[PDB]
Amino acid sequence: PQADYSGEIAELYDLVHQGKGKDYHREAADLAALVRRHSPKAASLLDVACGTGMHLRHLADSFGTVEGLELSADMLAIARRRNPDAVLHHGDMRDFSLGRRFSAVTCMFSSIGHLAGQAELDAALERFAAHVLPDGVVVVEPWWFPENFTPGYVAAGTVEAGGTTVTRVSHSSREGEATRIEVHYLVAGPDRGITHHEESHRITLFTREQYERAFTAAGLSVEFMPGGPSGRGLFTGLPG
Amino acid sequence: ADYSGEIAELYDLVHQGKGKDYHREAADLAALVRRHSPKAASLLDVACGTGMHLRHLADSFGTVEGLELSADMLAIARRRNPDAVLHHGDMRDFSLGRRFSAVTCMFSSIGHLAGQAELDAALERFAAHVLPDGVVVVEPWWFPENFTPGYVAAGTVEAGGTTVTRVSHSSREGEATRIEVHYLVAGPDRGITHHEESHRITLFTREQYERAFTAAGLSVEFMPGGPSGRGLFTGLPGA
Numbered sequence: 371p372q373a374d375y376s377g378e379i380a381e382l383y384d385l386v387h388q389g390k391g392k393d394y395h396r397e398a399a400d401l402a403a404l405v406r407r408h409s410p411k412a413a414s415l416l417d418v419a420c421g422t423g424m425h426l427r428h429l430a431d432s433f434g435t436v437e438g439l440e441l442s443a444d445m446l447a448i449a450r451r452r453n454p455d456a457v458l459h460h461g462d463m464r465d466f467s468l469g470r471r472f473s474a475v476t477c478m479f480s481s482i483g484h485l486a487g488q489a490e491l492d493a494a495l496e497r498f499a500a501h502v503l504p505d506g507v508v509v510v511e512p513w514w515f516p517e518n519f520t521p522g523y524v525a526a527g528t529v530e531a532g533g534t535t536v537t538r539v540s541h542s543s544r545e546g547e548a549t550r551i552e553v554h555y556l557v558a559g560p561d562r563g564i565t566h567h568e569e570s571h572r573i574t575l576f577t578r579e580q581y582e583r584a585f586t587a588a589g590l591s592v593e594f595m596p597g598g599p600s601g602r603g604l605f606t607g608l609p610g
Numbered sequence: 611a612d613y614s615g616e617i618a619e620l621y622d623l624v625h626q627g628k629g630k631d632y633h634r635e636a637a638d639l640a641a642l643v644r645r646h647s648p649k650a651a652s653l654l655d656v657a658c659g660t661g662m663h664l665r666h667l668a669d670s671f672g673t674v675e676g677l678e679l680s681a682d683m684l685a686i687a688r689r690r691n692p693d694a695v696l697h698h699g700d701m702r703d704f705s706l707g708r709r710f711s712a713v714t715c716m717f718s719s720i721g722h723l724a725g726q727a728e729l730d731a732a733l734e735r736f737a738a739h740v741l742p743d744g745v746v747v748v749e750p751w752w753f754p755e756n757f758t759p760g761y762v763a764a765g766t767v768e769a770g771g772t773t774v775t776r777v778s779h780s781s782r783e784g785e786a787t788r789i790e791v792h793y794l795v796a797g798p799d800r801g802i803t804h805h806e807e808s809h810r811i812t813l814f815t816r817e818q819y820e821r822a823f824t825a826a827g828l829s830v831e832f833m834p835g836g837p838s839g840r841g842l843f844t845g846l847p848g849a
């Protein structure tokens with residue numbers, strides 16, 4: 371049971387989230403508009419935990435420079451193939467140092483939840499502040515806050531494309547300060563038969579004030595906007 | 611063991627999810643029986659499984675009994691049909707010491723036999739348990755000409771807090787279908803569990819079924835369509 375977005379799990383990622391109705395084109399359009407509201411001259415964007423680089427692909431149409439940081443080599447390989455021109459980095463949002471600063475540092479789809487507690491979140495936000503330009507914005511899509519988390523939640527969905535049928539079932543429970551989300555897959559095709567895969571993640575249920583404390587310790591002013599890309603809302607931060 | 615444990619426990623929910631209507635099939639079956647035997651009063655369901663047909667057939671026939679090889683399936687059937695006599699046994703060699711107006715074998719259970727000889731044997735046993743005015747009914751598996759290798763079935767159903775996803779894959783293995791079936795079973799407390807079964811279901815030709823019926827002294831007819839699109843064979847003694 372893996373926790374590192376690798377192997378076959380990485381290969382299924384885009385198909386499954388497409389099946390669940392995720393619309394990266396609309397999300398990118400909205401994000402780019404939000405960046406330009408806070409920074410009308412923005413010409414550059416770093417997407418941290420870029421995964422398979424789906425947002426970056428669309429954001430390349432709005433900004434002259436897009437870069438990405440991704441911990442998982444297998445996700446990153448997909449991201450690079452999708453963004454063959456972009457400079458994408460293999461590393462860790464807790465401790466990274468790129469060549470430059472950007473008008474927007476973004477961290478989407480609750481990837482920030484993969485951090486383990488307040489020290490790590492603080493560290494990541496300090497790094498984001500370190501890579502943002504003075505008239506820029508830091509954008510973090512949080513995981514659920516403890517008060518909005520729904521333990522016992524089961525998601526199931528099946529999709530097919532290109533001869534491959536993929537079923538994904540998730541189960542979520544409370545494990546201390548985090549969601550434990552277990553995810554099983556059945557992957558079927560006419561000649562390959564059926565294979566079973568599993569993943570299991572601890573995604574931290576930070577409170578709003580814990581997010582805010584992280585932005586604040588980084589020198590960033592912080593604003594929460596409810597709703598956002600997944601019903602989890604959006605944090606925006608501005609330097610100095 | 612085939613059809614055992616958690617697989618047996620999931621059987622009814624997954625086939626309900628797939629739209630299988632045992633109430634309508636039982637009514638159609640009862641009508642077919644009574645067309646051939648208007649005073650029909652008894653029925654034996656061979657390979658009765660969880661006893662879903664029998665539950666409904668008991669409202670049409672004064673006596674219903676069943677034969678089932680799997681203990682875990684049989685336990686379910688008994689709980690569903692607590693007034694009925696259900697036997698633990700094998701369609702290839704059983705002997706109940708009585709006869710019935712109908713002997714039925716539904717949902718391609720006959721595919722669990724291998725070879726002409728086992729098929730002949732079963733049909734002889736069915737003839738040995740049918741009344742002389744009655745009828746043997748067997749739902750075949752697919753004929754070779756209609757089998758679709760590489761077939762993938764996937765569906766998800768939820769009942770009572772439990773979400774079950776079933777995915778089957780089918781290929782050719784000699785003169786049979788190899789069907790492998792994976793389940794993901796999920797619930798708020800239970801989490802997710804994975805289960806798997808795998809079966810060989812023999813691709814008997816139409817002529818093979820007819821040979822089995824004729825050797826058991828039954829006059830045979832194939833009725834196309836049937837409960838599953840695979841038709842139904844009927845057989846009447848005294849040929």
Ligand SMILES: Cc1cn([C@H]2C[C@H](O)[C@@H](COP(=O)(O)OP(=O)(O)O[C@H]3O[C@H](C)[C@@H](O)[C@H](N(C)C)[C@H]3O)O2)c(=O)[nH]c1=O
Nearest residue numbers: 479480481514518519520521523525540542549551553571
């Ligand atoms: C609607 C609603 C949902 N939830 C929770 C329950 C459950 O944990 C989740 C819905 O399950 P899903 O299987 O639909 O979760 P998902 O597609 O959002 O995947 C989640 O986990 C993946 C493993 C991660 O890769 C992913 N991010 C980090 C990329 C993460 O967002 O959202 C709540 O806690 N409160 C709610 O009001």
Ligand SMILES: Cc1cn([C@H]2C[C@H](O)[C@@H](COP(=O)(O)OP(=O)(O)O[C@H]3O[C@H](C)[C@@H](O)[C@H](N(C)C)[C@H]3O)O2)c(=O)[nH]c1=O
Nearest residue numbers: 717718719721752756757758761763778780787789791809
């Ligand atoms: C429509 C069509 C289907 N098929 C085949 C392909 C595949 O093997 C099957 C459809 O898949 P499914 O997973 O829908 O099969 P099913 O719910 O009917 O389960 C079958 O297998 C189960 C393991 C058995 O327990 C069961 N009987 C013996 C009780 C048997 O009927 O039917 C064909 O070969 N040709 C066809 O034209």
Ligand SMILES: Nc1ncnc2c1ncn2[C@@H]1O[C@H](CSCC[C@H](N)C(=O)O)[C@@H](O)[C@H]1O
Nearest residue numbers: 419420421441442445462463478479481484
């Ligand atoms: N410490 C860390 N630094 C960088 N990336 C991380 C990380 N911990 C987890 N990740 C990455 O977080 C990503 C979560 S999946 C989200 C991917 C992408 N933002 C999207 O919207 O589709 C994964 O690719 C995972 O490898």
Ligand SMILES: Nc1ncnc2c1ncn2[C@@H]1O[C@H](CSCC[C@H](N)C(=O)O)[C@@H](O)[C@H]1O
Nearest residue numbers: 613657658659679680700701716717719722
């Ligand atoms: N040799 C044999 N004798 C009796 N039952 C058998 C058999 N081989 C397989 N079976 C039974 O055949 C059944 C197939 S499942 C079909 C069950 C039922 N007739 C229904 O329509 O739902 C299983 O319960 C299996 O255990």
